[PDB]
Copies of this chain bind each other. A is one copy, B any other.
């Protein structure tokens, strides 16, 4: 259900493998490819509710470093129109005095199509 390629409304793509142990591993997109890691409920309830998950990307790679990281929190909904609904937080490293403006909040939805 979760393993495979997902597309965000804006162009971004993520490729992920969901292990039997509750692990998420993959990449977020060559100068713009980045490593991701996360966890998920490997035994969800059967009564129709979604499957909880989360993952992180640090924005550094062989070609650039933005000195920041994003975390996504949300749930997988199965079916014909499968989707992953998230909210995210983006934190940048800052000095002592600019800490208050260090974190962005947003949201996103991913589909298979």
Binding site for B on A (CB under 8 A): 10, 22-23, 35-45, 47-60, 65, 67-75, 77, 85, 87, 89-96, 99-107
Contacts and interface: CB of A to CB of B under 8 A. Distances in A.
Given A37-B23, A60-B22, A105-B104, A69 B93 contact: no
Contacts of A105: 87, 89, 103-105
B87 A75 contact: no
Contacts of A41: 58-60, 65, 67-69, 93
A35 B23 CA distance: 10
A45 B101 CA distance: 17
A38 B73 CA distance: 13
29 contacts: A22-B35, A22-B58, A22-B60, A36-B39, A37-B37, A38-B56, A39-B57, A40-B69, A41-B60, A41-B68, A41-B93, A49-B67, A50-B99, A52-B59, A52-B91, A52-B93, A53-B69, A54-B56, A56-B71, A69-B73, A71-B72, A73-B90, A75-B92, A75-B99, A87-B107, A100-B106, A101-B104, A104-B105, A107-B107
